[model samples]
Target: LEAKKEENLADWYSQVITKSEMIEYHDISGCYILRPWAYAIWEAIKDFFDAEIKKLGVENCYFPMFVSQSALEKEKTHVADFAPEVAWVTRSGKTELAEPIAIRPTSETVMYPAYAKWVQSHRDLPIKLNQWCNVVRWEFKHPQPFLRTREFLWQEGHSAFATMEEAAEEVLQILDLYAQVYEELLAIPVVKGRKTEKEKFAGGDYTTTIEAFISASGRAIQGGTSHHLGQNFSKMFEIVFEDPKIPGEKQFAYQNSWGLTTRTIGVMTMVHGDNMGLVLPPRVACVQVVIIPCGILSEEDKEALIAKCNDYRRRLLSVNIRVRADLRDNYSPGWKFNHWELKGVPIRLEVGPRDMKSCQFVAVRRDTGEKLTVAENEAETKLQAILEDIQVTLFTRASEDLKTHMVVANTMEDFQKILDSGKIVQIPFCGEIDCEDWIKKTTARMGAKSLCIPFKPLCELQPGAKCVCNPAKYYTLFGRSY
Candidate 1:
């Protein structure tokens, strides 16, 4: 009913997002209106993460969106390089201000100054805070809806600790939670890894990330990142505390900042959605099961059919299932089926006069158009089990796609050919920025970049081995990225 997903992925995505009522293009070049459906999905995500972070001693807080020019410039190495992308406000109320203010591209520059003030002693060493907010980067590249935008929603966490070991442990803890967010809630498979020096976040020691593969374009999308800022930022901002053990000595606090954004929603959509529309995991779908009554009949027959649908809907809802019934008139039952299918409802229950008399309904699965006659008495239990099955099936399929596409590339010629074949190449890299630059320039046509050095080694290599570009420092995952 929509554009072919495999043949025209870009167009298919655009068509599905609009036709399925998720988002609409805004007048602003790099912005889009998050429709109710999209916002609902985001709310589900926010609820899960907010609760999880709170369990780890992270308190929710808010900060100003506008950062003083001087504050943004406090960390010269990071801020100076990112200045061009920063959106600024120079005028207020039609009057020129004394100095321009920069909107936060991220919160590190804006939050660390306060972190410097909050810690006076070891008692205040670990300050874990998180905020749900929007950020502006003003990217100049061709804007893709949720993948790249001027302003977007995300949760940014900033924490300071007394030791590097604690900071490093926390980084992985947050990274693990991020992996769970993708696998459990979104039904997307991901790889956990540490970013290369050139790819790591600025003003941080090392960035750990969860990466997801988009099969449609054969590109990698970073699902989320958790960085151990180390003392680089605490030193710059003078975030120090008196060590209780050595009262006279002062030590800088180790810091961390990690974020997960709306970009993740886009990745999930690309990974699991098909031509029918935006297929969602049961956990993420706001309405998991929809009931539609079929058949052309008299008013009395329609009334009885709709009443039966409502009874089943309530039964499912009682068990915490998200269920809805389409009782609207003037639209045929077939039209209702297509409507819910396009919207990616996981299960559809169709009730008609004949089916109602038989004490059963025709149940259809959105993932596969398989149909079955479900008895009214056992409908709720069957739907719950089926929803869980669909969730696992989606995850299994994506995991298979990820496993098959990753191949070992031992030479530059093989790397180029594999990348061109719409696959990710695992090759040895020397961990040098110069080597990374050379590889990018060499594979400019294929748009290949070093994705990450996976958390666990992908393969065993002999000691003192040399990479395709230089002496091998580590085996790394390489691919084109979104």
Candidate 2:
């Protein structure tokens, strides 16, 4: 918390993640340790998402993190994709191997071969499997804790479908789930859109994404992405099956791959956190509520206060609330209060002798620092309402930030000016690669790129409008990003 978020973003983020016990920098560069405090949030994401996907018939499985060079190179188009940073294991235990083994930058190359092996008929045409695993990219850029780490945890869903349309539907379906992860759980608002040709995932026909903005840095980050691989990978891996209508004709399966990473946690931290260490949404916070007994000077009264706090904890726990009673005598009340707030507990219930006599506790909100008197009898309903209100409040504020900081740049005069002020701009564009490259060259000083072609624009494009560089088809979002 030594660094002000507005003064130095990188310093503030580094301090907040580390100080909150969410991340521990590993000895290996671009690597980090997700301590328990942070892992619980990840687990919460897993529990909700895993159940949703399972209901859609997406089964969970583990694929090897290692890939054979032969298999990795099968996707010839990968040379232009994530090939540069792919790590290799040439030797093990001082023994040189016959062929180098590559750590998976993604599972498409590693898993597609198995898909080709398993599909024999139309019944096996639809194979939906998700892998919860770690991927290594060995990026050369500066590595932030969760955003751009070398090895980070994520869930990649790769599925094969008999029809291209069905696969397309699944792409957006998974994308909506990604939206829920951010908007519902993390309390972060995002824009759902399609990546332009210059930004789409390589070798995939198209890519769908949810983008979240970090107000502190005035930067946009991809919340998650779903890619429709079409028949590209199936053709490479030879995943063919007999066409249901044609007895003898063989057809390649249309495929899709979607992924969500630990980056969501970083975006949440950046979007909701303030000068106070961290501000977590109650939905996924490890400790949603922490009860602390205060103002007890006498030892005899201290024991009674401890018992009261425990009773409150039990009652809250019975209602399935994640709560804790801070009954440690060694630490002073003020220190305990700061500790829980630093850890981003959404609510704090202060129980003192006077408040106990009134059968109420003072509830402190971590997000707004508002204190309220809560009756013990209505604890469950009132606290639940407060937690829900905090979640909605965080999202509404983030949505407002996104709305306010965006500018519509139909003209070059306004484009450069708006970008210079560190705000994302929507520009009319025909989605050409060359135009995008030229725009990149001009905005290189500001570290800007086309984020996406937002489905919803700030303003409707009037008739006879065109791009600053080419003919206008739609509006593309541009911003500096992590």
Candidate 3:
């Protein structure tokens, strides 16, 4: 069954998704609603990170959801790159608009203009803000539910600094935050690197991204990104700020933008989900512990058991833990087990007449079915420690997989085989789009591309003529991507 699960991941995922009620098709292509079971997990992640990031001086802000066609066309390269994927709002009720506007595939075009107005002097330096919102793109090809879709939820952080040093530091700081999210909450391993020029965001000067090597699918996915816009947007809009030290000296704002999306959830699912179902790390599991009472006798017995369950729930709640109790007598213990398990609850507790009589109950860990019989008073403490352990363990395991698969291939034949196997390859290249394009053309049927490059700590080359591709270029990180 495990082998079949690995061989037929789509089928396995379908069963897990349906059984767990995480999501379902909603009569539309590239669209689905996240059920409470899934949405709750996302909420926990958002709340946790929002607080953590805010403490680091980032504030939440809102931006326009629509952009005028002319505004989007202002940045020539931006339009050229994003026009193909834009979703336009052409018609308005019974009448057509004078000019169709875009649904904002991203907020850069709309936000930058407002930024020009708000930024006047050096005091306006370090405009740090983030937005939690939904965005839409046409997404016509290779669409997946949470991974790729017409519309989804994400948080985009745009910051401006007085100096290049500040901007650079902010870029890495945001990257660190992304790394923390993957390592702490999602429990997924990620590679910190820079995007190749051929594969960067439309208007970005340079982009640093976190790439996840997925074990289940043997593929690479972009976990998150922080883009250094330089003066790209400022130049386009003539955004200038005065330098305080030299009264007359003017400087363009150094800008950076970073983002993480619901796509992380999809990658986590693919990484940790198994034949039994999704083995969610406890950090993001909406319902961390579920209590089910068995063997009810009189109304008095049922009432007493319910009281004990409620007491446990309150005790857990005091420590900021989300807890639920299955008290409906109509549902059998077996039914409750399957329901909770499919929903990917991290911990489940069984309290029966005998268990209560002995002043002990049963605890089951979701990541691995390790059971423990514990005293009633010790339940909360044990659950808290075990959940933390699971989260840490999952991250370590995923990191191990990434290290195992990131094989360095020196020859074209070896590279081709690794590409066929769908593993990320670190190779020597001439840093030419044409060369990368040729590789893509020859291996188009195989589905691959040069995803990105190393940012500061570049791959050092020996004293020689040079790159394998041209013997005159630089090395890059090439791989499959989302």
Candidate 4:
């Protein structure tokens, strides 16, 4: 049975994803197979992001999948955050290796050491590199496609800078690109801000994020994160560069790292999906338009219709619009309607016997099934506009949802109530680490975290609204996160 979109979110997600053939579970409990229907979207995302960041001179590179135990433990708190979920390669085909190797949960430790070795002078000061790879975390609690999984695909950008200001600027600039990814590809809006000390990534100087919309149920998913490593990681890894201007000066390189995973795909689904099924933004829909024929029984009619549909498909493909026609004989036009709609195709064009006679096709938008009689000759140009319209409309609609769910809190009591609703609570607090730890106790859902404290506040605080501490002047943002 189809559940109402508002009735049961978890069940709705399971049915839509499975029915739409987006992903399939592997024999391994935590592993999933990304079906072609879903993977097409990821390919589109990869191409877009690769070109966008490449403009910043970020080069794509690959790192080893395994990290030695001693090498991984060099970063103390990072190991703690990732220790429980990490998989260890203790043995080879028969015998154990000299040193047990850990499957990478994140590539920072593995890559930074190599960065240290590569940088010997100021010429290498701003090394901008990115890697597109699969990471393993061995997650135990629950598995959700794209959202939370043991192994997921992501792109991580690691950069080295001469000054903290440059490193910080890169961190935010990359986050801006990530924010665009959410808005453009997924039709999801996000709250961009910096992490409170308590909520930042383990072993990070600070983390900045764009936390995207959850459901009416009040859950929030962190779409992406960009971190400024300051001198902490540089010192540990010894990524030092000679100062060109100063005769004999050497300084630790300021570092920044940013990442966005397939989880962006999951957030996009959660924000716009409905009772009908998954609702994809036009940009990411594998097949933006599907052409189906109605009232065709004769052999000649079938030949003429299928050929016309196939011809139309080729024409649309030439313009780079993903379009397909269902010529499968077993399924009727009605069945194909439900099938493509369930898969979240943005537009469906029905060419009935009557429509064919008039040299027009019936166009139906997935977002709102507003049917139109479109001229067959100009279908490509019209369909392009419709797809663009669908993309823009989805973003506008999600932006409204984000505005309704997020609430600001100045006091602990108000903060707790907002947490109860599952909405993110924006708060001002002393930047002390202890106060953030208190928030964990107050809102203790395992791994519950804050989003970010924006570099700039949305509002100027009232004079009476002080930090939840003995006035030292600090502010941060709080939220229940995925």
Candidate 5:
């Protein structure tokens, strides 16, 4: 039996994903096969991001997946701690190799050493490169499709700059692009913020993130992260160069690394999906419209219906809409309706014999389940508007969900209670690492985590005010996360 969307969200998600033909579970643990349907969505995302990053002077590049032990061990507290989860190639065939190589968990250790070699002068100061690749983390935790796969697809960008201000600017610029990917293409809303010290990327000075909330589980999913690497990595890898203006002085390049992964697909699915199945945004849906005939008739009548449907489909296609007609003989019109609805097609156009005779067709919206009759001549224009409306409506609903679920907490007791309520809590904190760790430990029972310290605070705080966690002053969003 299909699971109810609200009562059992996890089951509903697993069922809906497979039923809609997005992904399939692989034999290997922590891995899933991205079916064509799912891969198309990723391709749509790639096309958008690849073009945007290129405008910022970022060129696509690839790095070796295997990291030498020495290169990987360069960043001790960061890459070294991930040793347990690092996959290794210990031998050639059966004989042992001289050195064991580690597959990249993240590309920092694998790529930065080369970056050190590339930047010897100020001319090479701003080397912006991005790679679209798969990363292996070998996670042991529970694995889910798209969201927590061990080997998932992502785009990682590494850039070096002459100044921290430039690095900071690029970080937010990349963060904005990520926000657009989620809000515009996926119809999901997110909060832009900086990660707490305890939650930031291990090797970076600070991490910025776009966090998305899942209403069903009341958990926040980190949509993407952009890190300001500062000089920490440059110092370790000797990514230093001579300043062109300062004759003989040498300075390290400021760096940044940011990534958006397949997890975006999972977050979108969770945020917009219902029991019927995936509710895709029109921008990313592979097939935006489906035309189905609604009347049972003789072959002659069927031929006429098909002809009219083809004409309408051609009109939509001329305007560059992804449209398809279900002219299968085995399935009933009702069956076709359920099929497209389950697949989350944004619009379904049904033309019965009566509708054909009247020069009209009925259009059904997947997002709202609203129906409208459109004249044959007006179908294309009306459908275009409907798709845009569905996209906006989905985003509006998600934004409202986020607003309703976020609560302010001025006391630890209130914070704990808000955690129990399965909503993100915004609390003024001292912005100390130890205090964040304490808050996390205090609410560990409910699986709570500090989501992020947002760039924009929900409310202004006095400069001299003490944090809820301590005497320092900063507001942070705290919630259980995926």
Candidate 6:
């Protein structure tokens, strides 16, 4: 990688993702094609999350990409927030359409009408559907791959229930799943929290999120979000049921919508990736263990080495490991080593002449660059431990980074100082939008925002505690964010 992650993060990120073959820039601005390398990681997250949400009775479904103008405008506040970025098709080919069609920036309005049609009684009260699809937001700002792009892939889940408690409870459950995706699969730690009113999802009652910090840039990113719609969309779309407790009365269903996007790939890159390149978590890395044949040998010896590598590959695969053997005669062993390391394979096993004589091979760790020789007998179990250790180590390091950079700010001056020093600030807050707006104004153009109000308050609030900016009752987190 030509760019240094510490010296210049933006350049480093571009170089890392591009050199690693994660994405390819397309002809259009603000759009990138997901190469196999990147898509494979997303697939790993999808497989885990899809199975999890399904286990929660959230069925997978699809919705049309186009929304009629009327349906798109049904929810005023939601439409207003997305109006500027919403893409519209005014014509088809060479002819103009009767009414411009809007490509969904989200599926709330597009799917809620159908939700209304499907629910007629308390028996059909809960409708939980999730869709994996692409969305377009015609952003005019600078486009960064996986972070802020005009188009991206995400799984948006929309659910409706008879009781607000069910919707609220499911929101937290989905948020927990999102946290697992980050902390378990990506080897990153995140804070579980609720968005401030000013920052919550438009037209939703409340929004819950998993916020992750990037050590390199000292910035926070939203891992994913679950929203409690609180009958807002249900009321707009008339998705109601007969009130079972009161005959002939009607009750609006409570709703929830959540999403985890390809942007997660970018967060993992920024958090764990180093100056060398991507440092992928073993669970999400497509190629967990790569076996390479290395050394100077004659034709006979080389053939025997290749055979040994194939044998190791077979053994590893039999144990359900994601393993690959790089034995092509075209590239030198050194070149192949650099290639796999840059691609962020978790473990690399090298078989050479010295190893062939001992019936053992060398295992190299991508996370720590530690090399250890494993006996043939111990290869299977030892390699598994090494992979597990690498996973734990990556997460431990990141959690430490977040802990080190996050500190308390009792005053506005202190907030500015901590922020400039690349630390996220924890402040006593009243949880008021007016106070949050003032904070945003004070930090305008600094790329800062109220990240979230953590479930575990940042600090303890006394009976008569005063906020650094608001009437204090509890604590919230403040930081520069992506």
Write down the lDDT of every candidate, Cα atoms only.
0.87, 0.88, 0.79, 0.82, 0.88, 0.89
Model 4 has an lDDT value of 0.82
- Report the backbone clash tally of model 2: 0
Clashing pairs in 4: 194-452, 194-453
TM-score for every candidate vs. truth? 0.97, 0.97, 0.93, 0.94, 0.96, 0.97
Instruction: Assess the local accuracy of residue 143 in candidate 5 as a C-alpha lDDT between 0 and 100.
Output: 80
What 10-residue stretch in candidate 2 is worst by lDDT?
Answer: 74-83
Runs with alpha carbons beyond 4 Å of true place in candidate 3? 1-4, 77-79, 244-249, 455-460, 463-466, 472-475
Q: TM-score for candidate 1, please give it.
A: 0.97
Better of 2 and 3 by TM-score: 2
Model 6: residues with Cα > 4 Å off, grouped in runs: 77-79, 444-447
Worst 10 residues of 5 by lDDT: 74-83
Per-residue lDDT of 470 in model 4: 52
Error of 1 at 65 (Å): 0.4
Q: Which digits, one per residue and each the tens of the lDDT, describe model 5 over residues 232-336?
A: 889988899977688777799999999999999899889999878989899998899999987785888879989988988899999989999998889998888
Clash statistics: count for each candidate: 0, 0, 0, 2, 1, 0
- Compare candidates 2 and 5 on TM-score and give the better one: 2
For residues 293-372, write the lDDT of model 2, one tens digit per residue.
Answer: 88856777778888889999988898888998888879988998888877899999999998877899999999899999
lDDT score of residue 85 within candidate 5:
87
- lDDT-wise, the better of 1 and 5 is 5
What lDDT tens digits, residue by residue, belong to model 4 across residues 18-125? 888988878987778899987888888899999999988899999999998888887663746557898999998999799999998888889999889989987877
Compare candidates 1 and 3 on TM-score and give the better one. 1
Q: For candidate 1, lDDT tens digit of each residue in 175-198?
A: 999998899988898989999999
C-alpha RMSD between model 3 and the true structure: 2.4
- TM-score of candidate 2 versus the correct structure, residues matched by position: 0.97
